[PDB]
Structures are given as C-alpha cells and as structure tokens.
Amino acid sequence: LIVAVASPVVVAAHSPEDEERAEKEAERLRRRFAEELRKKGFEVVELDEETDEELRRWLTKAIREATQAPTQEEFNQAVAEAIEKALERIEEIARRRHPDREVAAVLTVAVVHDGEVIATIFASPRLREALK
C-alpha cells in the first residue's frame, strides 16, 4: 500500500513565526505517524508542492466558510466533510501517479490557539481499512 501524506495545512496563524512553529509541530506529528506506517510495511510518499498548496488553499477556504456555522456541531460536520473530500481527492491524485499500486492518503491539520499549536492527523478510508 502506498500512502500519500500531504504537507500540513496550518490555519489562522497570526504571524509567519507562528506559522513556521505550527508547521514544525505538524511535520513532527506527520513524521511520527509516517514512521508508524512504515513499521506496518506501508510505503509513504509525498505530493508535489503545487498540489500541496492547492490543498492548503482549498481546505483553508473550506474551514473559513465553516466558521459561519451557528454551533460547534455544525462547524465540526462542515470541516469533517471538507477533510473527507480532500482525502478522497488526494487518493485520486496519488492513484493517477501510482496506478500500479493501491493508494491511501493522510491529511495533517494544525491551528495556533492562545499561543499553542494543536495538530491532528486524518486518515483516508482505504488507510483505515488497511490498518484493521
């Protein structure tokens, strides 16, 4: 199984220094997750910078739109749907790049809130299936 891991999407950083701090924390999380995948025998690949930046632009816009929701619950559902569609698109892109293999995807999302970085890893459906 080839797992394509996207560059982290850092959202709402107040300064370039905070964004770099969030990028490093999210990259460390992605690195630890990728090493865990390789222990399971999975090949881990990366996207090109243009695809990563298109993913960043789209998911940041989707998250910005979701802040208009009236409740946390509706916000959660909007962002979860956006993440699911972004994961599906990364799988499709990676499948076209590696058509001889089964492909899965991993998305990392980070935020800076009250001076701290919170980062989270999201696995595509095929990856979750493979990890069973």
Binding site: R21, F75, I118, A119, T120, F122
Partner: peptide, 30 residues
C-alpha cells in the same frame, strides 16, 4: 457565525480535539 476574534481558532481547536477523541484521530500539541 464567528463574530468574535478567537472564535475561528477556538472552533478549529475544538474540532481537532473532538476528532482525536470522538473519531480516533491522532493529536499533538505544544
């Protein structure tokens, strides 16, 4: 909607912690 200032970051932070807890995603924080 998010009318305040830290509303957007607080909403997203809550989601990330919610995803880790209620859906088994993997989270890290400083």
């Amino acid at each position: 909607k998010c009318n305040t200032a830290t509303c957007a970051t607080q909403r997203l932070a809550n989601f990330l912690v919610h995803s880790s807890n209620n859906f088994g995603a993997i989270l890290s924080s400083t």
